[PDB]
Amino acid sequence: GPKFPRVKNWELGSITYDTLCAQSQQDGPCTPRRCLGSLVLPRKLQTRPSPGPPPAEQLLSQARDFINQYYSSIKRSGSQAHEERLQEVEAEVASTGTYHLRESELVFGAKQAWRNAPRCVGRIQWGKLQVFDARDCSSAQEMFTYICNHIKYATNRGNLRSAITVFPQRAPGRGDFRIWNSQLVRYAGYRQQDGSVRGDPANVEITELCIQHGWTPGNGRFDVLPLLLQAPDEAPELFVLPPELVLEVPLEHPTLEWFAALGLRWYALPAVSNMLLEIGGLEFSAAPFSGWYMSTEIGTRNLCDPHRYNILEDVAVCMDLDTRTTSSLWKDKAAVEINLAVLHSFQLAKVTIVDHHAATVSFMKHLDNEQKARGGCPADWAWIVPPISGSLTPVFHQEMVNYILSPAFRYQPDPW
Amino acid sequence: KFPRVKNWELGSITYDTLCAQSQQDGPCTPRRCLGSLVLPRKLQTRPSPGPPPAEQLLSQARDFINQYYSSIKRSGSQAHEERLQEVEAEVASTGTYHLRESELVFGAKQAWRNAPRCVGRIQWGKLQVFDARDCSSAQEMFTYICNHIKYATNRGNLRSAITVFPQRAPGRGDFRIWNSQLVRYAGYRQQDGSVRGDPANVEITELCIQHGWTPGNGRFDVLPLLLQAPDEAPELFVLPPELVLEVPLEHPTLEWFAALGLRWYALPAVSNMLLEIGGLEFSAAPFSGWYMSTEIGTRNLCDPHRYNILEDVAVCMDLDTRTTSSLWKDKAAVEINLAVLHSFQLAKVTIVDHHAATVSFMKHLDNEQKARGGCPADWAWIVPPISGSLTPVFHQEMVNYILSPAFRYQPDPW
Numbered sequence A: 001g002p003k004f005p006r007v008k009n010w011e012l013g014s015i016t017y018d019t020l021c022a023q024s025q026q027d028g029p030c031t032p033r034r035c036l037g038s039l040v041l042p043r044k045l046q047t048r049p050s051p052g053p054p055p056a057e058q059l060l061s062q063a064r065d066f067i068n069q070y071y072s073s074i075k076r077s078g079s080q081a082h083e084e085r086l087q088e089v090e091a092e093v094a095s096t097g098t099y100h101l102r103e104s105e106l107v108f109g110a111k112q113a114w115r116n117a118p119r120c121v122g123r124i125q126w127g128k129l130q131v132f133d134a135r136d137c138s139s140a141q142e143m144f145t146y147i148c149n150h151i152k153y154a155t156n157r158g159n160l161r162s163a164i165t166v167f168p169q170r171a172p173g174r175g176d177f178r179i180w181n182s183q184l185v186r187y188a189g190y191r192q193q194d195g196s197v198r199g200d201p202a203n204v205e206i207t208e209l210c211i212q213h214g215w216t217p218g219n220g221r222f223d224v225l226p227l228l229l230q231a232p233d234e235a236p237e238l239f240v241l242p243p244e245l246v247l248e249v250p251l252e253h254p255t256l257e258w259f260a261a262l263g264l265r266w267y268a269l270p271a272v273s274n275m276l277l278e279i280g281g282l283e284f285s286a287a288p289f290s291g292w293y294m295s296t297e298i299g300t301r302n303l304c305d306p307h308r309y310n311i312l313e314d315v316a317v318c319m320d321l322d323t324r325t326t327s328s329l330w331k332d333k334a335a336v337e338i339n340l341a342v343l344h345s346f347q348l349a350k351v352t353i354v355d356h357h358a359a360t361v362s363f364m365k366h367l368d369n370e371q372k373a374r375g376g377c378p379a380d381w382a383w384i385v386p387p388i389s390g391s392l393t394p395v396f397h398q399e400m401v402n403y404i405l406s407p408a409f410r411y412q413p414d415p416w
Numbered sequence B: 001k002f003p004r005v006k007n008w009e010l011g012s013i014t015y016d017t018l019c020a021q022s023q024q025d026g027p028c029t030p031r032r033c034l035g036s037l038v039l040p041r042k043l044q045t046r047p048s049p050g051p052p053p054a055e056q057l058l059s060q061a062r063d064f065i066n067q068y069y070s071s072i073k074r075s076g077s078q079a080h081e082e083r084l085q086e087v088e089a090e091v092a093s094t095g096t097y098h099l100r101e102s103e104l105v106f107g108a109k110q111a112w113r114n115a116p117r118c119v120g121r122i123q124w125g126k127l128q129v130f131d132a133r134d135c136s137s138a139q140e141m142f143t144y145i146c147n148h149i150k151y152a153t154n155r156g157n158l159r160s161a162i163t164v165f166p167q168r169a170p171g172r173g174d175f176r177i178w179n180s181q182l183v184r185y186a187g188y189r190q191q192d193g194s195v196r197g198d199p200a201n202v203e204i205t206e207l208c209i210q211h212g213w214t215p216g217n218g219r220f221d222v223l224p225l226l227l228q229a230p231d232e233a234p235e236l237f238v239l240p241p242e243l244v245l246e247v248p249l250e251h252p253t254l255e256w257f258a259a260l261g262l263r264w265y266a267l268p269a270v271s272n273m274l275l276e277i278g279g280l281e282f283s284a285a286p287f288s289g290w291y292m293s294t295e296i297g298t299r300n301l302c303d304p305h306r307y308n309i310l311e312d313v314a315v316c317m318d319l320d321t322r323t324t325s326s327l328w329k330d331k332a333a334v335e336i337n338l339a340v341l342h343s344f345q346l347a348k349v350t351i352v353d354h355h356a357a358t359v360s361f362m363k364h365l366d367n368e369q370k371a372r373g374g375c376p377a378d379w380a381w382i383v384p385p386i387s388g389s390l391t392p393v394f395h396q397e398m399v400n401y402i403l404s405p406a407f408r409y410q411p412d413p414w
């Protein structure tokens, strides 16, 4: 039949065609010979640093293209305002080499970039995003203030609200605005003497970087790291977040009274801050965004991954499960009780959280919405399915097509 | 060119060079990835309007022969050069050729090894290959099938096997086994849209009745086989009950579990795939090994469009079915997978849990890295349907491609 990817839902038997992928202008990692679709960081999603300004011709088309998406969203394609804005963009690129977005355009692309994120299962909220314009920012100290305002608004005392703060874009012959940390809120990872790590092994490099930059270290599993904010052509400056601004949740179990005594906890606000935001060819090297957690992110990946808190065994022991044999499914039993702990603790502290069931069910609804609106939705299957109970969620049975659409959130090299 | 692969749990890195030997294309392109698609019309070996191009067949043939002689280390020997002569001579005159039993045995093991969606490929060298290429009727097919079953089952101490029926011939029909597996439970579409038994088998259950089978009305009624000899209507054969080992499910601690009347067969024998070796295609080549507990406990019994027993168990367990946040689904699933492992273990029937299975797969990945410089894997299929990140494979990046010999999907004969 149709000349587009046929996509099927095995639970429902329903069929759809993805026509939206025709819009993709950025190549992926796969070729007809092999699928490189399980690679976390292929050199097809990552945006290398451009030491020199993008070729005027290529910037122009990415820009002309973005403006078109913008006007189509307001339903003024072909209009005088549309054609004028186009002439205005090339005029600016012609004399300066780059151009700038209007306030409403930035808000559009930012929402669009989230909307285009293949690995995000919470895109049913894509329209609800508070875009804080911070393109006026000119110092690392000011970045700190904006971030504190971001955390305050976004955290909203446990009734979290999605938001992103856009700092100045990459400008030729001038350094980038960078947040060295991966997230605004992270736990320190201390490299022990015996070789191990106290805290979060993931954050070991940044922890040592903060120390080398004047940070006075603590020695706990859950120490919140300080921000290492960087302004153009200046070394990064260290800033310590006010404890009152960082809302955390002490984990406890609804039935297993001893879970509380484990001293486990997690911060309520998830804010990626190392990702690059690309809109119409313009690159925003620092633009932290945040929403709310899905239970499995904390209870399974963060707490149970081998290379993270790895608390699976400790909980298994407390539960008195046979940790000597795999066929007892002690890893399965503990993980379920740990996720149940994250859910219970957050629901008690009145902090926002969504479980993997409700989360995937809502993404399916988002998929219907997008089929009607754009004829498809770029989705990364391995990332959409929860790290536990996979086939128990509707998304598992949903085939997905993955591709890159702009605007978008891309990975970028570490500033060091 | 050569994909840099990484394991995020150990931070180790390897370059897959084996992908360079892939000659068949997948559904992916640089514009988009379709790797999560179960069966694209592309890879699928559908029927043909005549005999395959001699040029193409000859090249896939010569290639395979090269593989075999490399395997026995006689690459270059007179026996190697004379087998190429025989194949060239035979293709040039008959438009096809035939395989020696030994080569077919090497092909089948290599087909399994190259299967990207198989997590148990560590056992790839251990395969009993029954040469059934001297079959001329459905009745003979059935006797060969009963032989395969009786052997593979081995009173519960399961062994991996494959029975290879006559290859495909241009202008002639195909030897086909209509059932997707030798052992399956019936799916009776009841009046009110409901489905008694296994929903995934509703169509084949109907085909059997259409062909004269007298159906039951249980949830676990073993289906009869519809075997088809070339250009002939399929025939109905009922498997001898003694041949079909089944395991009654019970929980080690939940006494009421048994009362649910749940059970599942011991032998997983896929009978609808096509085995291609050196350009030749075997439309009927049922193969079997043993179950990984998740296939039964999670997928077969818990999938929405399958038995879908999740809620029932949840209620017996007296869980909070009101909200999704009480994780009742996850809780019921873990106990269901447990009951399976207990039952198959109490009954002395081979079964491997997803933890043991994936650990062995990691080991296999290692062996293959040294052996052939890579290993095609379909991440979504290798990672079990529950506790994904709780297993070593989840944290392993994988490269997926098509190597030959290979098991391919094929159209339904009806």
Ligand code: HEM
Pocket: A114, A117, A119, A120, A121, A122, A123, A125, A129, A162, A163, A164, A289, A290, A291, A292, A293, A294, A297, A354, A359, A383, A409
């Ligand atoms: C509203 C709540 C949200 C939920 C529950 C949600 C959930 C998730 C989850 C489960 C992931 C997987 C992360 C991982 O496995 O590391 C993810 C990824 C992602 N989300 Fe969302 N998300 C939310 C909000 C947002 C917002 C507000 C943005 C941006 C404006 C966003 C952008 C992304 C991106 C770009 C990724 C990719 C992460 C990566 O590549 O490492 N998400 N999200």
Ligand code: HEM
Pocket: B108, B112, B115, B117, B118, B119, B120, B121, B123, B127, B160, B161, B162, B287, B288, B289, B290, B291, B292, B295, B352, B381, B407
């Ligand atoms: C030794 C015991 C074996 C175990 C534990 C094992 C396990 C598995 C599992 C869990 C899958 C995925 C099944 C699904 O999700 O539907 C699979 C797929 C498959 N296995 Fe194995 N396997 C074994 C033996 C074999 C043998 C003997 C062959 C071939 C001669 C084989 C060929 C394949 C193929 C081609 C697939 C893909 C199935 C499909 O596409 O539907 N396996 N196996």
Ligand SMILES: N=C(N)NOCC[C@H](N)C(=O)O
Pocket: A270, A272, A290, A291, A292, A293, A294, A297, A298, A301, A302
């Ligand atoms: N936006 C959300 N919900 N998460 O984004 C990534 C958060 C990361 N998986 C973590 O667990 O910290």
Ligand SMILES: N=C(N)NOCC[C@H](N)C(=O)O
Pocket: B181, B268, B270, B288, B289, B290, B291, B292, B295, B296, B299, B300
């Ligand atoms: N070879 C093995 N183990 N299985 O292959 C598929 C069998 C299928 N998962 C089933 O549930 O019957």
Ligand SMILES: [Zn+2]
Pocket: A030, A034, A035, A036, A037, B028, B032, B033, B034, B035
């Ligand atoms: Zn792909």
